[PDB]
């Protein structure tokens, strides 16, 4: 908000436009794991104990946030391609009952109407990018999905991706909320922005931005195929990082 704060934030952005590496990879991360489980909080605000879905819902409800929608296979971020809250509510038949505030918001948060409890995984788009100045491999987050992991009769994930949150837009509304991170410490010392920036959403890669625009589902249907493909992608990026190593044979033993 302050001029110095804006200057620091601008100096803090990752200017990636001319880099000889722009590998964009899509990762599904399970909240069941202890690392990502910071997203299993009660939907109600109750002060500051909120998950991501609750605060995104609260921000989009007040029309203070600009967000985009899904495309079922592609990801086009266009100004005309804007998600409509009517389409958001008709996804599960949520009533309108417009509020008298109007300017503050048009739809009242109906307590537990948001499916914060039944979302169990997160989609993330991470762009591993080289740097033309300091030659350090880094990551830039731009998009995520709170995939609707519903529970039907046979237990299938039955995912209906609600919409596409651009990280740049939600960043101002995440850099302030500083919820607890690790259960064995239970300290309010790291913001959720620090959680995303520090690359702690350990999960498995669903598919990269391949030329064929394919996914891991095209491979063997067995889940072990998904695990082996995710580990293959992970070790291939690890090998890309290792290819810059020039510090071999440092044992100095005879």
């Amino acid at each position: 908000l302050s001029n110095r704060a804006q200057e620091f934030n601008r100096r803090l952005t990752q200017k990636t436009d001319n880099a000889p590496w722009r590998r964009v990879v899509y990762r599904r991360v399970d909240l069941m794991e202890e690392s990502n489980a910071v997203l299993y909080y009660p939907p109600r605000p109750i002060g500051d104990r909120k998950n991501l879905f609750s605060t995104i819902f609260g921000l989009i409800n007040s029309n203070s946030l600009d967000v985009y929608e899904y495309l079922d296979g592609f990801e086009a971020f266009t100004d005309q391609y804007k998600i409509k809250f009517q389409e958001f509510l008709d996804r599960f038949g949520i009533y309108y009952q417009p509020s008298t505030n109007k300017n503050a918001e048009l739809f009242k948060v109906a307590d537990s109407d948001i499916p914060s409890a039944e979302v169990k995984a997160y989609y993330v788009k991470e762009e591993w990018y080289f740097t033309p100045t300091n030659s350090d491999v880094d990551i830039k987050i731009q998009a995520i999905c709170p995939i609707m992991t519903g529970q039907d009769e046979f237990g299938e994930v039955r995912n209906q991706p609600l919409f596409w949150i651009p990280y740049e837009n939600i960043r101002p509304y995440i850099a302030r909320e500083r919820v607890m991170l690790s259960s064995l410490n239970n300290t309010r010392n790291s913001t959720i922005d620090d959680f995303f920036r520090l690359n702690l959403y350990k999960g498995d890669i669903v598919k990269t931005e391949n030329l064929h625009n394919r996914a891991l589902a095209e491979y063997c249907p067995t889940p072990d195929s998904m695990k082996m493909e995710s580990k293959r992608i992970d070790k291939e990026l690890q090998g890309f990082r290792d290819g810059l190593f020039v510090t071999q044979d440092t044992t100095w033993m005879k």
Binding site: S2, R4, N134, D136, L181, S182, N185, L200
Partner: protein
Amino acid sequence: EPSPFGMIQVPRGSIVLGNKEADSLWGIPAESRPISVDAFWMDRTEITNAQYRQFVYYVRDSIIRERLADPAYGGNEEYKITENKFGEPVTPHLDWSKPIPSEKRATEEEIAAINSVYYTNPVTHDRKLNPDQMVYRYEVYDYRSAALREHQLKAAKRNLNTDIKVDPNAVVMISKDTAFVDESGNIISETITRPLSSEYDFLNTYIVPIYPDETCWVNDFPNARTEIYTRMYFNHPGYDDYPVVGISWEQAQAFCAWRSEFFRKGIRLPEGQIMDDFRLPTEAEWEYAARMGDSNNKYPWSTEDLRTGRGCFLGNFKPGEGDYTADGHLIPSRVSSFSPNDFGLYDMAGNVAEWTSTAFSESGLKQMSDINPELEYKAALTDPYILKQKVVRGGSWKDVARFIRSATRSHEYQNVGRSYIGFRCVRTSIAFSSGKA
């Protein structure tokens, strides 16, 4: 070579800058990334009470010099007026070649001017220096922000991409904090967000009280008696070789600036030209100077254990639970008490935790560069207090062995000054090392 006394030339190198494995009990991620730093001069001992006492003596000297220079409080009018020797009408800021003020014998006006900054206790009749009238005024130049592309004076020079035409009416916002003094004596620090118009938009003037917060010995230690500490930790003549505590980060910057000013005034050398001044050490610089630039060095000693072969303790931290004096010292011990690391730095991890320039963000390592990295956030006035959080490192006497490990970040507010926060003044060395390793 200048080679300042009390300094050690730490060479350039690289450090992993963190710890890979994480204490599950502590529940921290323990993030790390390699970082390389250049060579610089670091003072071996934490700045003791003697050095900061020299600083406060200097500021008291010129304070009373100015007060006696006022016509209403003595009117000595030494200064330096027009026709200085060879007809030089120089600006009369202050005269320092004048005879030193004399105690006991003086005129009434001179005694009144001297006592204007002294403070006598109504109930105790003890005279000391006024904490709110021991103010240091200095100026710093934001060299890094002045050379930025978007902060260049000429608008057409702010964008080297010729595809988009440069608008002469560019709306760019600058920042500048220049505490100015008023007629009432209440020093008011203000921030200005005027549009970039001239070079003056890149100079920051700071006037801050510099007397250490002795009350720190009491405020952060409730239900404990420290009368023998807050009373004369600074004032005791025997407490000269002990590091000073209670220093605010602002006072740390002020003292480093004063050290730079003293170095510039003394040893006249036109060859130095734009030779680098003193500053606070950065987070990466401090950690590299601590762990010897070695990945395997968890602590600033060769071995991985806190006990030597004979069981002796290195560094006056808290060894055991409620066992502050197991090492041998309870409060911040005297400098150079323990065996130094071969890098030449005394009490590298121990004694008093160190002020460092880089602002804490909890991103930190994963958000700065790889060459002499540091974060600069000169937050001004109307900012949230969270953002005014300078990071500290080193581990103090009160902190357990976990915090004595060099690769441990820790919060600290720049405004507050605690009884466990020392600091160092560090300079950049322009050394033409041939290498040939």
